[PDB]
From a paper:
By integrating comparative genomics, transcriptomics, functional genetics, and metabolomics analysis, we identified a unique polyyne resistance gene, masL (encoding acetyl-CoA acetyltransferase), in the biosynthesis gene cluster of antifungal polyynes (massilin A 1, massilin B 2, collimonin C 3, and collimonin D 4) of Massilia sp. The monomer of MasL shares the general fold architecture reported in the type II biosynthetic thiolase family. MasL consists of three domains: an N-terminal α/β domain (N-domain, residues 1–121 and 251–271), a loop domain (L-domain, residues 122–250), and a C-terminal α/β domain (C-domain, residues 272–394).
To investigate how bacterial polyynes target acetyl-CoA acetyltransferase, we solved the crystal structures of MasL in its apo and two holo (bound collimonin C 1 and collimonin D 2) forms at 1.78 Å, 1.66 Å, and 1.40 Å resolution, respectively. The asymmetric unit (space group P1 for apo MasL and MasL-collimonin D complex; P21 for MasL-collimonin C complex) of both structures contains a tetramer of the protein, as observed in solution. Although we did not obtain a good X-ray diffraction result surrounding the reactive Cys90 in the MasL-collimonin D complex, the nucleophilic addition mechanism of polyynes to the acetyl-CoA acetyltransferase was confirmed by mass spectrometry analysis. The observation of collimonin C/D (+C16H18O4)–derived adducts of enzyme reactive cysteine residue provided convincing evidence of protein irreversible S-alkylation via nucleophilic addition to the conjugated terminal alkyne. In the further comparative analysis of the polar interactions in the activation pocket of MasL in MasL-collimonin C and MasL-collimonin D complex, the C(7)OH moiety of collimonin C/D 1, 2, His158 of MasL, and a water molecule formed a strong polar interaction network, including a direct hydrogen bond (3.00–3.16 Å) and a water-mediated hydrogen bond between C(7)OH and His158. These polar interacting residues for the collimonin C/D 1, 2 (inhibitor) binding were similar to CoA (product) in other thiolase models. The C6 chiral center of collimonin C/D 1, 2 is critical to forming different polar interactions.
Author numbering:
A (entry chain D), C (entry chain C), D (entry chain B): 2 to 397
B (entry chain A): 2 to 396
The structure:
């Protein structure tokens, strides 16, 4: 058990809205700020960090190796190596899985793992500029669609594919809007109660006329109602059910945490928040966007030797309200135990950071509630799912 | 021995030149072709593949998750998960290290790992197109520079930084050109002897006029001489030493291999080529581009409990001739044991595939020569190094 | 006197600000709207229009032959030919000079002449996209700079060259700012008195949420003060004097008028506004941006057999406050007779339309004041000037 | 005879192929070279040049006022004014008409008129780059299509519209290919006989390894046969008749000449080549691309008091073989008098220069053959036509 792998000091920036407060702040700078703050608050000797692993999906234009920028600009010694992982919308949780594997295999003793993303900062791409278009009009591609949200096999948006999940599982528009309004209401009430203050580190943004201290999530809509959501038009198919109100936005943020054995965390005076009891990574047909969390959660629960009913809360990414409903109802999870404090429809989905954001949220929620067992899971894009089974570590 | 981690069936495409035969073939398609060929030749049951891990540096414009495209278009079942790693010029070796860690930690039993890159296919980037340039001229950035070759902290080319390595270690232009000419001569003789045929899988490219069967490396320059290299102008600093002739090109290629325990490989009827005996990952100041292999090799050798003199061959990426000379000389390696069959100055440096290409090269060279111990190492970009200590597995 | 060449029915749109009300309305559409309104108000038989000539500088992206689009989309019969002229910032006056030449040479009897511009609608240019950039970063050029405001020989902005005019004529910063503040004051007072209502035709702009009727100039800055202008930084040279406050903006608009002999105008029931008594086109060194009006005015006055002191008002384009001061003081024009109702620093400089706008302003101002003699003149860019000497025609 | 308007010293570059020898040489540099050579060969006193007028269609990216660049870099004194005209594919002939109107109206006494174009050098346009694309892919437009070859009302290529002319006049594919093969054969034989050497001025192109002297037209295909043309696929409509072999290419070149009264040319020691006896400019429905030369020719002939049978040769631009056939057969012109030495299918169509190239060709051909009367005409784009009726002037 001393060899159990634990997460300590999980922290996140607030999440920016599209064209919002973080629109001019690169993803790697958001990560560097979290890492700098984590080092400050823990007092961890920076030389005890063996590697930095960061998730980031839209690497275009972010410069050589985002994770190395996070590490060096986060103030770690230049001797700390770093690399960037991409499992699309699961990347921030993949970074933690990568850290687990490096610790259990003996390659590292302590890793800073997390993820970063800023969708406004994703550039446009000009595939014909290197060797020429020659004659005739040519296209400039939005990288957030080409590398992040469109399926690589069909070139259709993930939301377009999710309409086929909607049809297969008969998920009504009204159920999606009810779930979305509930996510907004749960999130706003938790935010108002101060429940996210412990996990959020403020970022100071410098502008022309001055400075903004960005300290609280800004992308949520607390006035959302089922009635207002029913006014909206479908976003991905003319006859569809998915709208801008029952899907997350295009967001920016970062989160990071310390991954180590429990023995190492105790030795260094850290306070572990969660032990990783199981990991699942699964894949399905790419067109079946949204279902991957079901087999991945089953794998993670098998490794943990837990059943669904043993779990106090599930935190499953709300890539679309439809995905949350399908996963919840396929696994038979109680609605009061699913995305308890709201999810990405409210707070935003900064794709390569969201898995780390969900781990951070669970670390702090279990501390507050004294719940013992949680599962974090995300659909990937391209037909994959990732899940972690997590248990609270008591305060020593 | 059961749980030693081994590499089996390492294979690679030939390496394309800049603006060359592979210029219209995406990196993910190159990887898919190697993986399809690997599955066909080994007869490995596709359901035994637990994950595909691919290195790729210039992910811009390649579509969602290059590794998943490699896996699915390589013909693996959609149930095989996949993810893409980026440790810059070490990414293809990082994929193998990631596979090692997944197997030793129990997350996987068998992984297909490798790397892919196509520098011609890297797009240009327009940072001001989303929200507008408003007024005044604006820049379109070459992604291969912004995301691959320029340092992220200084925005200078890696070759500009390597001039400071050259100055610190007093690496003469004459020695850089001697090393580059030797790499071309060694590679040309090995290619003519057929020494790369076993590791290469041909790729058929469909063009306007018909089909080209691309079957052998095309980027080397057998016309290279030291006298010719001495005439070239410096590429990165006015009074510099690094030129287009003592640096590799901007290349395309892919390589992949099976990583598993030795017991799993024997059970499934594979023929292991190499056992991973040590892994080193190190970092230094970003400005000291090129030195990273020295500490990384020392880490890998310490894990293997080998000394430099025990190693039959070192395969260290020739990111510039100057880097090869510094690493060789600082570790005291004999020149006949350093990049024995030539290196990237001759064959090319498709950045995210090169580490997997070098592992492939060593797997086949140790089989041919019966040498026992090798080290593969690459500098990263950004001040890092990766190294693996590798031992031949008998037939 | 029957064969004298006259201007009738001069009209203009209001002038839009940069990123303002006309930002989505192409220059050719602005011209079409003026031409359609001119035809409706005059009742001119459309078959009597022999040609349409329009000035336009930033032709990039406007589609084949802007003048033909203005004519056809303005409702003229397809049998009316049309062509587009470019003498940079003098293009809208050049269109009238071209019309004069076609009528006096017998090629035409009646021409609709004017100019159009919309600086927001100027695209960016990618010179390397056709045949490729190959390797290394490449530039996307702002067409308004490449084709409109930068000198073609030096690639420096016209405002950079004007700093040498400032140094040659010892034009103080304080005098430039006084001239700019006075232009704003004169314009704001004339606008409030209703003096621009007769020349302006409103344009209705359709948007997502509805419609805007754009009916009055929007680019002026009536709360400009000399003290506020003194705080601004130089725009073109570190140690310069020209700023954003003593130069016009980047504007959009159109203007058009009928040009014919006097006999033809009377025959067709038009009411001539001005007779063209002299035309001057001159050129000087490109680096001497701003001086061209001086020799051009002298040529136009020589043709008209007038002296400077015979002229009731000069309307000289305020490309920069410094140009207005140099031209006024070199010719010895009384300040109360120079840009009497304000100029482009206040109302805007939609480059290819401005010459037609100034002719329109003078036609209406002389009608209102009963002044007899005026001169319109503009510097061009590239070291040229254009001028017309104009006399009021009494009502029939 | 005194005040008749004459053309002297007409000269042209050779015409470059698309992606050919002139691909790196701006249009304005081609014109400056012709003007410099014209001044050197005639010995004309540069102070006697009153204006430079140049046609140019694809002005995007060519810098401020192409005609002023031609004049200044051609070595004329900076005191010579200049402006650029755009009547699409008739621009180079429009520059001569503009010069005629300025001389007859008394604005000028001697003008250098011509046209320039380089289609390789036309840039791509990015309409969304100024104010952003926000989200989603966006288009980069080829300026040669947007501003030169596509109709401004339909956005279809001029060749697509010409398929309707083909259908209206029942112009068979076999006839189009016969006309195109004959144009190639006539051009190749005339070129081999040396008949274009007198009008061409060589251009020296500086390249990597050294210098190329470009001295002869390169875009023609002397091996063209009717049987080879029959194999080609239609270029503009799937069921079409127009192919890359019965249409011109995308070419580069320049041409210029001196325009003055006959008395002025004699006074200055020039040798007039042609007198302008009639000018016609006509317009028709835009969709009837290609028919415009018919009414324009009729107007020019009426001005000259000539009929078709009085004309020794017609030089009508081969915008497509179909256009040449329709114009020839509607006017009843003898086939051996229509495009006698070949036309643009063979030599190329550098759009803004072609009208000036055709005038140059006729000036030299009439001198060689002692023919007396010729007509030059071009379709415009957008449903217009321009024509000039021209008579040889004897040597003094
Ligand atoms: C791994 C994968 C995934 C995914 C996803 C998703 C979310 C899509 C929402 C996005 O399309 C949203 O509707 C955009 C609204 C932007 C509106 C604006 O321009 O402000
Ligand atoms: C991880 C890092 C790295 C690195 C490196 C490198 C190689 C650079 C060589 C490249 O600059 C080469 O000189 C380009 C020549 C291209 C010439 C052409 O346009 O054909
Ligand atoms: C023929 C020639 C000319 C000319 C001229 C001019 C005016 C230049 C003013 C322009 O540079 C102005 O300062 C631009 C301000 C725009 C600020 C914004 O982004 O809103
Ligand atoms: C004013 C008007 C007009 C016109 C016109 C025209 C000519 C079009 C020929 C062009 O479309 C040709 O097909 C282009 C071939 C280029 C092929 C290549 O890429 O090399």
């Amino acid at each position: 058990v001393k060899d159990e792998i634990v997460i300590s000091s999980a922290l996140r920036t607030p999440i920016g809205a599209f064209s919002g407060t973080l629109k001019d702040t690169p993803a790697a700078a958001l990560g560097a700020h979290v890492v700098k703050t984590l080092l400050e608050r823990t007092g961890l000797a920076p030389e005890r960090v063996d590697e930095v692993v960061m998730g980031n999906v839209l690497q275009a234009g972010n410069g050589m190796n985002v994770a190395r920028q996070v590490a060096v600009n986060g103030g770690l010694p230049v001797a700390v190596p770093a690399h960037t992982v991409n499992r699309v919308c699961g990347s921030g949780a993949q970074a933690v899985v990568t850290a687990y594997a490096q610790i259990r295999s003996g390659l590292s003793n302590l890793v800073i793992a997390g993820g970063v993303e800023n969708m406004d900062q994703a550039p446009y791409l000009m595939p014909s500029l290197r060797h020429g278009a020659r004659m005739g009009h040519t296209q400039a591609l939005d990288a957030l669609l080409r590398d992040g949200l469109n399926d690589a096999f069909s070139d259709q948006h993930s939301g377009w594919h999710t309409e086929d999940l909607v049809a297969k599982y008969e998920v009504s528009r009204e159920a999606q809007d009810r779930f979305a309004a509930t996510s907004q209401q749960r999130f706003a009430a938790a935010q108002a109660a101060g429940w996210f203050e412990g996990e959020i580190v403020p970022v100071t943004i410098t502008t022309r006329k001055g400075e903004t201290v960005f300290a609280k999530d800004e992308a949520n809509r607390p006035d959302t109602t089922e009635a207002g959501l029913a006014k909206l038009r479908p976003a991905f198919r003319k006859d569809g059910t998915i709208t801008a109100g029952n899907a997350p936005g295009l967001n920016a943020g970062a989160a990071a945490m310390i991954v180590s054995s429990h023995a190492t965390a105790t030795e260094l005076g850290l306070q572990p928040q969660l032990v990783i009891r199981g990991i699942g990574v699964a894949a399905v047909e790419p067109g079946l966007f949204g279902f991957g969390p079901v087999p991945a959660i089953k794998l993670a629960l098998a490794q943990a030797q837990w059943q669904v009913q043993d779990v106090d809360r599930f935190e499953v990414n709300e890539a679309f309200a439809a995905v949350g409903l399908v996963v919840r109802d396929e696994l038979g999870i109680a609605p009061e135990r699913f995305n308890v404090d709201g999810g990405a429809i409210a707070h935003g989905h900064p794709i390569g950071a969201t898995g780390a954001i969900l781990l951070t949220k669970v670390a702090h929620a279990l501390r507050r509630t004294s719940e013992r067992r949680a599962v974090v899971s995300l659909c990937i894009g391209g037909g994959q799912g990732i899940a972690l089974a997590l248990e609270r570590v008591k305060l020593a």
